[PDB]
Amino acid sequence: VYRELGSIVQELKESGDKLEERLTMLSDVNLLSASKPRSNIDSKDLTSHR
Amino acid sequence: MDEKSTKIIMWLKKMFGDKPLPPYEVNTRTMEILYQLAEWNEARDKDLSLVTEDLKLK
């Protein structure tokens, strides 16, 4: 009984960890919709600087 | 006149590289023309460099 419950807890834990990882990824600011273009030209935008 | 003259001589040295600068009549008019030309070339060279780098990126 102890081995069986142990397996169920592990499966739930692995699923829980994977979900947290995905949520963290989806909350990345660069992925989030059309923030109003930045008013300042990004240092990485070489064309606008030129 | 002494500053414009220096700019012209430096510019001519840059353009003619390792070749001895040819002797020319240094008068007020020849210096003005050379000076306008030097300013124009410098401004265009800058513009062309920026365009060339951008085209590489594109």
UniProtKB/Swiss-Prot annotation, chain A:
Domain of life: Eukaryota
Coiled coil: 1-30
Subcellular location: Cytoplasm, Cytoskeleton, Microtubule organizing center, Centrosome; Cytoplasm, Cytoskeleton, Spindle
Subunit structure: Component of the HAUS augmin-like complex. The complex interacts with the gamma-tubulin ring complex and this interaction is required for spindle assembly.
Function: Contributes to mitotic spindle assembly, maintenance of centrosome integrity and completion of cytokinesis as part of the HAUS augmin-like complex.
Family statement: Belongs to the HAUS3 family.
Protein's UniProt name: HAUS augmin-like complex subunit 3
Organism expressing this protein natively: Xenopus laevis
Lineage: Eukaryota, Metazoa, Chordata, Craniata, Vertebrata
Gene that encodes it: haus3
Boundaries of the shown chain within the full protein: 399 to 448 of 597
